[PDB]
């Protein structure tokens, strides 16, 4: 969808209505922790709005230029195993960005950093809104410097007519109750979000592609903006329950993937053009390394980069992973020292590592995170 | 496919061959009721032919302009639940039109209205033929006022060379026998039709898209017109067995959806621009309402409109639904009375309500159907 | 991918690296038969390279003009049953060409014809490489006389930077060990290859379609060429194990399909324009015939044509099929005798019939193969 850097536009309308929806549908029986966390979120509405529009205007989204249109099966295809060369990091998808930003928001909320938690939650909802956008051509025709297309600017002009204020039921029944059933957030999210995204692709073909009339486009905007608002209210309800009840979604499960979220210092020359690798060592002395490389320019000064790693040994638990590190390898003969500010490592929806570094890494060097 | 308003063209050839196929393959052991109903259908061939081409030339198909090309997974995506905002009616698909017109044909046949039953059966086969048409671009390039494209007009010129006169086996064996196995018509139809539609999408990419040669196009027309004729013969065989044996496909199952087929009187000003809602009330006093809104202009004078409703409570049987109604809500301050001629409600492949109304509904009023 | 008729280019690089990969990853425990067959393959590298590029420059690929881009679900859709008119032969797909050429290579290797076996194996890998090529528009824009597109010529210029030399593990662990688990080669191949092809379609939409930048294209070439090389090393490892251990993948299973690979003599006028049919007769006297017809010109002088037949009776074993034949039917009144040189029939991954003919077939005649 469209949105503006000041926290206005379609994206901000969707998360604003998501909270309004929950306030209207919130059952009388919901626990007081959930009701109290909803009021903290309401206090931080402006951050939720900024978060919701930010990803289209971030720099780190690899110089470029933004395109937030994926085939709905991308995430599923990338999860398969066999079909990915394991030494390469997996690219970000709208599906994986929802999970990463969700894990970050839960982590921040729990340590009492509500401003930052809500900004991250907004960013998760941005990507959910994008995967529900009914636009799936092979070749994109962008009309602005932030990578939006005409269907989104058309909906933007008309956004106020598509607002909804209830999902049709209270949070003790059907839609909302089914969202709490699966404890594994990542597993739930993958299936839940995929349903909305596939319906958006069907609607692209039947009503929103460029050959369709303006009436069809208006209809496509109405139904997909109502699906966006409903799906968004569902994520927010799930979020409130997870942080109120102190749910850990990672509890017990194998570690198939690890996600690194790396913040490079804003200091002049802190970025690097050398090869960077992430590595682990398990309890039984087996190791795995990965290349950290996304399409654009990785590890630029002041960037926040995301790398997703697929494990070869699928039977591991988080507690089996004893050590982790980052390793630099010189690309040229000329020094290009690297200064990370902080690294967060996420496994099954939990931030398991949050380490401030703020040290220069030079030459061919291995920096131990743990 | 192409077709003409007088019951000629590719569509009419497909249903004509569908009956010819069944006459050739009809086993010696088929019951006399099936054989007798086949002769009544043969007597009404002209209606089957008109029905088969009519939907491209109907008005109510929302002013417009017609496009009968859907992604094969549309129906499946729309059935999911979670991914549809329940207050909105679901849009018609080629898949859902086959089920609606099939239910109407069975209903009419059983009350001895063979002309009308066969016209409805033709209309069901029109939509099956369309979903088997190998044309699935994101953007459609229509070449006539009825929304046809060049692949269909190319096949139209060559239609007589693609005719088949047998599916390769008798109705006591394989293809035909498997069609009778599943008693739930709607469930069978969904899976059966989807196989032909997906094969049509594969063939679109390998042989029928515009970059392919004329030889490839001819091959695509040959195989997909033979699949259309075979699939059509199968539906007709299933129809003959269902009406001969007095099968009820709705028997026992939960009501997940309700379909309203509304005929608005042809009387001047009978149509309306006010908001229209459909509603039910179950045995335990729980209610649900839906907005009736399709992309074009709903409830126009003399129109026959179709609305598909998704139930929130998935455990209901037909006999649990005690009352149903339609409710009007004024859009402007100026009167715009509405006059329906008849409403048919369909649940799991059965016409459960068939009520003649022919009364003016005004103001903000609730009209009880039952 | 691109490639040249002299056994150079991207395709040849992929199969060359596939062997290099296996040499690096080959476990110390692999049996000496596997190690010895790898050295015979290394001796025949030039044939593996020629095989890998040949299919883009063959004539029989039906005059035309080549297009090796399929939707990933094509093979799966064609296997369904119900959705194919059984009297017509099924068209070739990248998926089915991998299976056909694999069966031919295994057959040749076993009779000691290593040159020809390795050339066939190359041809199987050509088609695997194509289905892993991330290019899936509805309409193709070819830029050379062999049907290549700009994404492939762009990767061709840069091919040397994308080479990999290991899959990341030894052949005693994970990736490689899972490849030997399923004994039914055809079943394994269908699922294995489909994973790579679906990932290629996702990458087409996110990075390789024409609207994406050059950086995105470079990234798409890197990951998909590494997937091609990895998948290719896996097929080659499977091949070495199947021929070393004398595996029969057909053992026990029902015959759902039969594949005919027909070589027409190079003699002047050996080809034919008459209708050609293939037929069988089972132990219980039941027969089935099929039309042999592909989109282009079938049975041209010196051609090697492939026809895939779907059986109606799905419960048959290979030993139930007693007789097979080819039947000619005059198209015109003027003689057009046909001279086949050899017919190979393949069932579940085994060459079950290999008959030299080299006899003229005239008029309306049935030629018994067995
Ligand atoms: Zn957006
Ligand atoms: Zn976006
Ligand atoms: Zn049509
Ligand atoms: Zn139509
Ligand atoms: Zn190629
Ligand atoms: Zn090729």
Give residue numbers after which chain C breaks (C–N above 2.5 Å): 61
Q: Is A136 on the interface with C (CB under 8 A)?
A: yes
The secondary structure of residue A338, as a DSSP letter, is: B
B169 contacts in chain C (CB < 8 Å): 312
- For residue B46, what are its two tokens? 């002209």
Gap between the Cα atoms of B320 and A139, Å rounded = 50
* Residue A68 labeled ligand binder: yes
**N residues, chain A:** 370
List all residues of chain A from 65 to 84 with a beta carbon under 8 Å from chain C: 65, 67, 69-71, 73-74, 77-78, 80, 82-84
Q: Between chains, do A223 and B88 touch, taking CB under 8 Å as contact?
A: yes
Q: How do B275-282 and B257-264 pair as beta strands?
A: unpaired
Distances, alpha carbon C328 to alpha carbons C262, C295, C334, C357, in Å: 14, 19, 14, 15
Q: Do domains A1-250 and A251-369 have the same CATH topology?
A: no
DSSP C204: I
Q: What does DSSP say about strands B257-264 and B340-347: parallel, antiparallel, or unpaired?
A: antiparallel
Distance from CA of A181 to the nearest CA of C (A): 30
Domain range list for chain B: 1-250, 251-369
CB atoms near residue A130 (< 10 Å): 24
- Token output for A123: 């960013």
Outline where chain C has alpha helix (H): 10-25, 32-43, 45-53, 74-79, 94-110, 114-131, 150-158, 174-181, 185-203, 214-244
Can you say whether residue B207 is alpha, beta or left, with left for phi > 0 and alpha for psi between -120 and 50 degrees? alpha
Q: How far apart are CA C67 and CA C145, in angstroms?
A: 11
CA B166 to centroid of chain Cα atoms: 25
Asked if B201 reaches chain C (Cβ–Cβ under 8 Å), the answer is yes
Selected residue of C132, C135, C202, C223 to mutate for chain A interface (largest A Cβ count, 10 A): C202
Distance CA C41, CA C19 (A): 8
Strands C275-282 and B350-356: unpaired
- Is residue A314 a contact partner of residue A367, using CB atoms and an 8 Å limit? no
Among candidate residues C324, C307, C350, the one with its CA nearest the CA of residue C90: C307
C168/A85 CB distance under 8 A:
yes
Distance from the Cα of residue A101 to its chain's centroid: 4
Measured between CB atoms, does C33 come within 8 Å of chain B? no
Q: Which residue of B has its CA nearest to C86?
A: B168
| Helix/strand/coil for B274 | coil
Write out the CATH class of domain C251-369: mainly beta
- Distant-in-sequence, close-in-space partners of C278: CB < 8 Å, separation ≥ 6: C258, C260, C289, C290, C292, C307, C309, C324, C325, C326, C327
Q: Judging by beta carbons within 10 Å of its beta carbon (0-12, 13-18, 19+), is residue C247 exposed, middle or buried?
A: middle
Q: Can you tell me the distance from the alpha carbon of C97 to that of B253, in angstroms, rounded to the nearest whole number? A: 45
A204 touches chain C (CB under 8 A): no
Nearest CA among B239, B228, B201, B194 for reference residue B101: B239
Q: What are phi and psi of B171, to 5 degrees?
A: -70, -5
Structure tokens at C217: 């294209």
CA distances from C269 to A286, B77, C302 (A): 66, 54, 10
Find out whether C6 and C156 touch, Cβ atoms under 8 Å: no
Tokens of B26: 């009809």
Single out the residue of C171, C164, C176, C225 nearest to residue C196, CA to CA. Answer: C225
CA C349 – ligand 3 centroid, Å = 40
- The helix/strand count (H/E) of chain B reads as 10, 8
* B257-264 vs B321-329, strand pairing mode: unpaired
Nearest-CA neighbor of C288 among C264, C258, C330?
Answer: C258
Q: How far apart are CA B312 and CA C111, in angstroms?
A: 66
The span from the CA of A141 to the CA of A147, in Å, is: 9
Token pair for residue C347? Answer: 């069932």
Parallel, antiparallel, or unpaired: how do β-strands B350-356 and B340-347 relate? antiparallel
Any CB–CB contact under 8 A between C161 and chain A? Answer: no
Residue A33: half-sphere exposure toward Cβ, Cα within 13 Å:
9
List the single best residue of B206, B221, B237 to mutate versus C (max C Cβ within 10 A): B206
Task: Give the containing element (helix H, strand E) for C288.
Answer: strand C287-291
Name the residue with tokens 């968004």. A232
Helix axes A214-244, A32-43, angle to 10 degrees: 120
- Which technique was the structure solved with, according to the deposited record? X-ray
For residue B327, list its beta bridge partners. B277, B366
CA of C155 from ligand 6 middle (Å) equals 14
Is A266:A61 a contact under the CB 8 Å cutoff? no
Which CATH number fits the domain A1-250, given the four candidates 3.40.50.720, 1.10.575.10, 3.40.50.1970, 3.40.50.1820?
A: 1.10.575.10
Q: How many CA atoms lie within 13 A of A74 on its CB side?
A: 25
Q: Where are the beta strands (DSSP E) in chain A?
A: 257-264, 275-282, 287-291, 304-310, 321-329, 340-347, 350-356, 366-368
Q: C89 to chain A nearest CA, in Å? A: 31
If you count residue pairs, one on A and one on B, with CB atoms under 8 Å apart, how many are there? 91
CA distance A132 to A220: 11
Read off the DSSP letter of residue C314.
T
B212 touching chain C per CB within 8 A: yes
- Look at the block and give the residue holding tokens 């509500």: A114
Strand order, beta sheet including C304-310 = C304-310, C257-264, C340-347, C350-356
Contacts of A309 in chain C (CB under 8 A): none
Task: Assess contact for B369 and B129: CB atoms under 8 A.
Answer: no
* Beta-carbon count within 10 A of A334 CB: 7
Exposed, middle or buried by CB within 10 Å (0-12, 13-18, 19+), for B81?
middle
From the CA of B135, how many Å to the nearest CA of chain A?
12
Tokens 């030894």, residue?
A: C170
d(CA C304, CA C325): 18
For B206, the closest of C74, C85, C142 (CB atoms) is C74
Chain B interface, mutation test: which of C73, C85, C279, most B Cβ atoms within 10 Å? C85
Question: Which is nearest to C252 in space by CA: C194, C176, C187, C306?
Answer: C187
d(CA C324, CA C254): 17
Of the residues C128, C215, C225, the best mutation for testing chain A's interface (the one with the most A CB atoms within 10 Å of its CB) is C215
Cβ distance A312 to C198 less than 8 Å, yes or no, reads no
What's the reported resolution, in angstroms, to a tenth? 1.9
* B28: Cβ contacts below 8 Å, ≥ 6 apart: none
Task: Quickly list DSSP for C94-124.
Answer: HHHHHHHHHHHHHHHHHTT-HHHHHHHHHHH
Query: Angle CA(C79)–CA(C80)–CA(C86) in degrees, nearest 5?
Result: 75
Residue bearing tokens 């050959």: A211
Helix (H) or strand (E) holding A94: helix A94-110
DSSP-based three-state secondary structure for B361: strand
Contacts of A319 (CB under 8 A, 6+ apart): none
**What's the half-sphere exposure (Cβ side, CA atoms, 13 Å) at C47?**
15
d(CA B294, CA B298): 6
Count the neighbouring beta carbons within 10 Å of the beta carbon of residue B325. Answer: 17
Q: Residue B152, annotated ligand binder? A: yes
Residue C171 DSSP class: T
Give the three-state DSSP class for A78. helix
Among B80, B93, B295, whose Cβ lies nearest the Cβ of A215? B295
In DSSP terms, A356 is beta-bridged to: A342
Question: From the CA atom positions of chain C, what is the Rg in Å?
Answer: 21
Kindly give the distance from the C-alpha atom of residue B131 to the centroid of ligand 6, in angstroms, as a whole number.
30
Q: Which position has the token pair 């997974």?
A: B73
């Amino acid at each position: 969808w469209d949105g503006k850097i000041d926290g206005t536009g379609t994206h901000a309308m969707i998360v604003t209505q998501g909270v309004s929806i929950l306030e209207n549908d919130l059952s009388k029986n919901e626990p007081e922790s959930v009701r109290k966390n909803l009021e903290i979120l309401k206090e931080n509405m402006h951050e939720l709005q900024l978060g919701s529009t930010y990803p289209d205007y971030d720099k780190n989204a690899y110089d470029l230029y933004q395109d937030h249109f994926w085939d709905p099966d991308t995430d599923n295809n990338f999860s398969k195993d066999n079909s990915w060369y394991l030494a390469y990091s997996i690219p970000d998808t709208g599906e994986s960005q929802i999970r990463k930003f969700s894990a970050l928001a839960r982590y921040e909320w729990q340590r009492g950093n509500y401003k930052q938690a809500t900004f991250y939650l907004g960013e998760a909802m941005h990507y959910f809104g994008d995967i529900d956008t009914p636009y799936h051509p092979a070749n994109v025709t962008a009309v602005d410097s932030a990578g939006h297309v005409k269907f989104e600017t058309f909906a933007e002009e008309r956004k106020e007519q598509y607002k909804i204020n209830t999902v049709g039921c209270k949070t003790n029944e059907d839609f909302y109750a089914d969202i709490l059933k699966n404890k594994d957030f990542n597993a739930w999210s993958k299936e839940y979000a995929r349903g909305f995204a596939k319906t958006g692709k069907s609607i692209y073909y039947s009503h929103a592609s460029m050959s369709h009339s303006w009436d069809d486009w208006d209809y496509a905007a109405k139904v997909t903006l109502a699906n966006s608002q409903k799906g968004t209210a569902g994520y927010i309800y799930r979020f409130l329950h997870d942080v109120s009840e102190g749910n850990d979604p990672s509890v017990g499960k194998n570690v198939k993937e690890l996600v690194a979220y790396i913040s490079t210092s804003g200091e002049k020359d802190a970025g690097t053009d050398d090869y960077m690798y992430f590595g682990i060592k398990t309890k039984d002395g087996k190791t795995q390394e990965w290349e950290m490389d996304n399409p654009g320019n990785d590890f630029m000064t002041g960037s926040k980069d995301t790398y997703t790693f697929k494990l070869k040994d699928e039977n591991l638990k988080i507690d089996d992973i004893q050590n982790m590190w980052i390793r630099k390898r010189k690309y040229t003969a000329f020094p290009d020292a690297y200064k990370p500010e902080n690294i967060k490592v996420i496994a099954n929806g939990k931030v398991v590592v949050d380490k401030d570094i703020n040290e220069w890494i030079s030459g061919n060097s291995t920096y131990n995170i743990k």
